[PDB]
Symmetry: D2
Subunit: 79 residues, 4 copies
């Protein structure tokens, strides 16, 4: 199954480097990411992903199952 | 003078006590920040586009500080002062 | 009192729908941070809007978007102040 | 020359035919359009930042056409050719 997906999460940046590195390990899955600096400590990120829905879960696992990542949510949009 | 601005730049996410520093200064100045768009342009390089809002002088000074970090390339500020 | 992530899919060529979505968003521009738009296919757009403010106001605003005829896959993640 | 580019511009959202044309052109050139960030800067005006990818001739021709529409203001292009 192919399609798009939306992966949102909150984290304390002071981890930011690890998450970007994690996304690049799957960068042909990534379309773009929106980042909002919600307070001095916390970041809100929303990554839009495109491709195989199995690759998507692996991306989401690598990000969401990390310590420090909160409020994770994956929405899949299969074709 | 108030307004908006678009600050863009490219950096290497591995060479990244820099990555930590870029996000850290945005947070120190988060009153200026609206939102940032990040595109992974290849395995090594990140394009970031930071939309800023506030006093154009403060925006300029902030942007210069970001661009002056070793490893930030293609640093570019487009100012949109209020009409 | 918090943030939220509003995400939805719609057909951009639907003139009344598209006009209504952006019109509601501009009426509540004070509750809006920024929106990411990605083109899904020839017909369909994916938008992700980050919202900020009172959770009541933010939810009512999101409901006004999601209730529009033609908005698909509408989803709201509320992120109340911690 | 392949690469990326950052195209930014401002327009009034009440110009519905202009708005529809901007998005329809992005979908027409879907290969060129990566993603777009939109900020509702006030009740009337929109700021959009489109990230583009492709041949720099194609990207610049696309940007010209957007900027050439009456009602598009503050049109700006930053070209990032492949390094
Ligand atoms: Cu942040
Ligand atoms: Cu990156
Ligand atoms: Cu679209
Ligand atoms: Cu707008």
């Amino acid at each position: 199954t192919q399609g798009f997906a939306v992966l949102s999460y909150v984290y304390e940046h002071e981890l930011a480097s690890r998450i970007v590195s994690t996304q690049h390990h799957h960068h042909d899955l990534s379309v773009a990411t929106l980042h909002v600096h919600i307070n001095h400590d916390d970041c809100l990120e929303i990554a839009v992903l495109k491709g195989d829905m199995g690759d998507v879960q692996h991306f989401a696992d690598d990000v969401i199952a990390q310590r420090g990542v909160r409020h994770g949510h994956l929405q899949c949009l299969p074709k």
